[PDB]
Amino acid sequence: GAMGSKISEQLKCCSGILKEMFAKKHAAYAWPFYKPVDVEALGLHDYCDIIKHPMDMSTIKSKLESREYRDAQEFGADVRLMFSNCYKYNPPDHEVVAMARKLQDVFEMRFAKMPD
């Protein structure tokens, strides 16, 4: 292409979505998801008994940068894993659940517009 890269259009969209999820506009609700859950710092001694496959936005970013995700479905599965872990682990009235839902709405509305 005259500008771009060689990655699929779909993966360009995934890139763009993750960039948005990192943007300042969303930071008040996105920040819990930026980095791996810090089980030591938060004293979450049950986390790894409950959550088999931790996921976070930085890990997702790394996997996009390495071209690990071969398509948008694989990317979207990791985003949804991140949110599902939050829903599984945390009390249902926890503020972090409310934050998850908001960031998940950002993600799902835009992911629904994936090129095809």
The answer to whether 30 and 103 have CB atoms below 8 angstroms apart is yes
Spatial neighbors of 90 by CB under 8 A, at least 6 apart, are 96, 97
Q: How was this structure determined?
A: X-ray
Question: How far apart (Å, rounded) are the C-alpha atoms in residues 98 and 116?
Answer: 31
Domain boundaries, the chain: 1-116
Question: How far apart (Å, rounded) are the C-alpha atoms in residues 63 and 94?
Answer: 29
Helices and strands: H and E segment counts in the chain? 7, 0
Q: Name the nearest CA neighbour of 14 among 82, 81, 63.
A: 63
- CA neighbours closer than 13 Å in the CB half-sphere of residue 64: 25
The answer to whether 102 and 29 have CB atoms below 8 angstroms apart is yes
**Superfamily of segment(s) 1-116:** Bromodomain-like (1.20.920.10)
The answer to whether 87 and 100 have CB atoms below 8 angstroms apart is yes
- 26 burial via Cβ count (<10 Å: 0-12, 13-18, 19+): middle
The dihedral formed by the CA atoms of 76, 24, 93 and 38, expressed in degrees to the nearest 10: 80
